């Protein structure tokens, strides 16, 4: 048997609208990471999906068809049973060129990435460019490009391609990354991609000393009809632990918290809870380590976490001292272009007065430039954010033509 343990590893999905993202994600897990309504109806990603699987290795088998996803080894000819390596996860991005701050946030929990390629259309696309350059400004630098639907396109076509490719990533942080074709819709090569994921995507170091800091992406009224009562819970939050560690029972507060009135003033109140229950997937833990979506079961009132109302807060533990800014200072560097355009603009100069979009760790705020020099800005928040370490990255965005665009970076001062 294998063992039931957390996902240790987080790996992003990103790539152009419609290359195959989520198709790629349910070739692996055998999960489709859409859950909403209005996913379904569209037939895209909106909100960050997530899926999860074991992974193994049949050490009487050849690669890369020795590397399974459950555990047999019956498909590459052999009755015994392969050695569980890891339980990995998948943090499935929209490709939309309107979510691109969807994908930002989700990037902040990526401990590597594949960037999905399609074979039939032209390359590189505004979100190919887009979020490659997302990836290498965030740091996530374990990449893999994954090129799909190479069921629709010539070998002649796909090797084009390739060659165009691997002339993009020349001269760039990932010269070195490989390119594995695949058909994500008719599960060709994921074998050679699971062998690629163990090779190029390793498990990262943890540091499990710090101060436990969680990053909320989701929040949940888990309460479904025709439940009996000693079956209701508390609201449940979900997220990726960037550091430390949380256990059942201890307590804990969702920063900033909840937006309320003191003092004739905007003020956010610190949510003071305690930790009931822990989940990964389906699977119930005492303690929950970086790695994975964890869903934090709380005693909080179910009408405060449904529909990801807390997503972007962080949760530490109790007493950490965690600073709450509605003003942040950032030393910043502008892109030179507008690489999510489809034809790239220069980039302008940031100017006082201007609305900016900022992402900091799984948040998404507006705020107005209030200082302007050669590196650095002030930026007054319509929210504040929870900065849990200094030099924090973050990402600038600046709305452009109707759309917010990526175009710049820097690290939060504090
Ligand atoms: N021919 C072919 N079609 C594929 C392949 N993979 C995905 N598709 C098709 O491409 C379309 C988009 O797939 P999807 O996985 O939703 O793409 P996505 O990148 O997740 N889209 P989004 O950016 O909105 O999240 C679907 O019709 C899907 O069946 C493939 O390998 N071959
Ligand atoms: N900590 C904790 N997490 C829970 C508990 N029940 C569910 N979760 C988690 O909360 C999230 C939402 O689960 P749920 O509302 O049941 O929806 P779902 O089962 O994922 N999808 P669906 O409702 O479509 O079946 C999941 O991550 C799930 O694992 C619980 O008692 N404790
Ligand atoms: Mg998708």
Redesign the pocket.
């Known amino acids: 048997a294998w063992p039931k343990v957390q996902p240790e590893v987080n790996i992003g999905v990103v790539?152009?609208?419609?290359?195959?993202?989520?198709?790629?994600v349910?070739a692996i897990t055998g999960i489709w990471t859409s859950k909403h309504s209005e996913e379904l109806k569209r037939?895209?990603?909106i909100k960050l999906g997530y899926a999860e699987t074991n992974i193994g290795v049949c050490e009487s088998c050849k690669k890369p068809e020795a590397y399974v996803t459950e555990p047999s080894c019956k498909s590459c000819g052999s009755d015994d049973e392969p050695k569980f390596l890891r339980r990995i996860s998948f943090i499935?991005?929209?490709?939309?060129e309107v979510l691109m701050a969807t994908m930002l946030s989700g990037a902040a929990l990526m401990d590597g990435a594949i960037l999905?390629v399609a074979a039939?259309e032209p390359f590189p696309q505004p979100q190919t460019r887009e979020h490659f350059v997302a990836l290498g400004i965030i740091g996530v630098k374990n990449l893999i490009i994954v090129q799909?639907?190479?069921?629709?396109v010539s070998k002649e076509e796909a090797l084009s391609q390739y060659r165009q490719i691997k002339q993009f990533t020349k001269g760039t942080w990932a010269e070195n990354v490989p390119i594995i074709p695949?058909?994500?819709?008719?599960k060709i090569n994921i074998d050679s991609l699971i062998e690629g994921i163990e090779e190029y995507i390793k498990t990262p170091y943890r540091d499990l000393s710090q101060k436990p800091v969680m990053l909320v992406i989701r929040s949940f009224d888990v309460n479904k009809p025709g439940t009996q009562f000693n079956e209701l819970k508390g609201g449940v939050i979900g997220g990726s632990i960037i550091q430390g560690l949380f256990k059942v029972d201890q307590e804990i507060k969702v920063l900033p918290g909840l937006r309320v009135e003191k003092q004739g003033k905007v003020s956010y109140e610190p949510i003071f809870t305690k930790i009931s229950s822990i989940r990964f997937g389906d699977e119930e833990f005492k303690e929950a380590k970086p790695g994975g979506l964890v869903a934090i079961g709380t005693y909080l009132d179910p009408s405060l976490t449904k529909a990801d109302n807390l997503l972007g807060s962080i949760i530490t533990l109790a007493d950490a001292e965690v600073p709450v800014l509605w003003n942040i200072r950032i030393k910043y560097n502008l892109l030179e272009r507008v690489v999510g355009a489809k034809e790239m603009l220069k980039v302008d100069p940031i100017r006082a007065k201007e609305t900016l979009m900022l992402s900091v760790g799984s948040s998404t705020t507006l705020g107005i430039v209030t200082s302007v020099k050669k590196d650095e800005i002030e930026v007054e928040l319509r929210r504040p954010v929870a900065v849990w370490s200094n030099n924090i990255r973050t990402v600038i965005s600046r709305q452009i033509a109707g759309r917010w665009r990526m175009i710049g970076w820097g690290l939060v001062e504090i």
């Open positions: 790539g152009h609208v419609d290359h195959g993202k989520t198709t790629l349910q037939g895209m990603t499935d991005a929209p490709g939309h999905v039939n799909n639907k190479v069921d629709v695949v058909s994500a819709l008719h």
